[PDB]
């Protein structure tokens, strides 16, 4: 089973029953209670879905030549005062989240409104779920990169890519205002798996008394 | 408890002589409630952990 680095030894509780199990959890956040792990997975899926929708919207507005996504909040002109929009969104989201809560409390998964599984096309399966999990994770990192590029650089998802393609050796993260910090991260991460291997060699994999983040 | 805990900071807090004292104190009481909340949780986790 592929892991988060070649030859990685997954934790004892990360046998592989769950989807997208790459044996990654250095802090051992979901190694105590199984219900908490299920809730964590539901939260991960929700964040991933929101990230995919956000990434798709940001990319679509950039491809059509619209202004920056981070600045688009003040460039929207239409009816309904800001307070009215806030109230409408809060009420509709409260009812939607209540329905989602009921769906999770019943079928253990997400849903849309009264529909517990919400699958008009009947495209539900363990193979399709893994696609959703991986796509959501990729979209989450994509949105994180979007925000990071908008903060460090003054470009968008397409402009940053164009700048990198123009000069890949001089237009990278290590040459920006956060390059030094980045250089310190890679250098550490580059030796993180090997160091872990040492622990698995000199100390062994016989579990530990405590957990990094117990919670 | 939460209702009776605002008054003290309202009339005696460091920013009591400012018009925005009510808001600051509401936040202070919320913080105090959260603190005594973790206190209740710790007491429950330590007291109830076994049967007899």
């Amino acid at each position: 089973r592929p892991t988060w680095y070649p030859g990685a030894t997954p934790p004892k509780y990360l046998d592989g029953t769950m989807l997208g199990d790459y044996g990654f959890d250095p802090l051992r956040l979901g190694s105590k209670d199984k219900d908490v792990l299920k809730y964590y997975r539901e939260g991960e899926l929700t964040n991933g879905r929101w990230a995919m929708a956000a990434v798709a919207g940001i990319l679509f507005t950039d491809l059509v030549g619209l202004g920056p996504w981070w600045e688009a909040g003040a460039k929207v002109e239409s009816s309904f005062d800001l307070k009215t929009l806030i109230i409408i969104e809060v009420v509709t989201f409260a009812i939607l989240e209540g329905f989602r809560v009921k769906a999770y409390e019943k079928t253990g998964e997400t849903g849309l409104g009264p529909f517990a599984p919400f699958d008009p096309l009947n495209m539900r399966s363990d193979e399709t779920r893994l696609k959703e999990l991986k796509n959501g994770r990729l979209a989450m990192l994509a949105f994180l990169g979007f925000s990071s590029q908008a903060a460090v650089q003054g470009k968008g998802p397409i402009e940053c890519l164009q700048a990198h393609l123009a000069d890949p050796g001089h237009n990278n993260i290590f040459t920006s205002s956060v390059g030094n910090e980045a250089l310190a991260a890679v250098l550490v991460l580059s030796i993180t798996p090997c160091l872990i291997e040492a622990k698995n060699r000199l100390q062994g994999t016989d579990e530990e008394e405590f957990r990094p983040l117990p919670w | 408890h939460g209702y009776l805990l605002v008054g003290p900071f309202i009339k005696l807090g460091p920013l009591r002589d400012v018009e925005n004292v009510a808001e600051i104190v509401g936040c202070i009481n919320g913080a105090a409630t959260v603190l005594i909340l973790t206190l209740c949780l710790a007491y429950g986790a330590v007291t109830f952990q076994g049967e007899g």
Partner: protein, 31 residues
Amino acid sequence: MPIADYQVFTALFLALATGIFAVRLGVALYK
């Protein structure tokens, strides 16, 4: 030439790594 913000951030990250090594040593000592 005062130290910049990036230098402080790098020092804090290195300190975080050092703290991780320290907690590992403490766990090994507890055993």
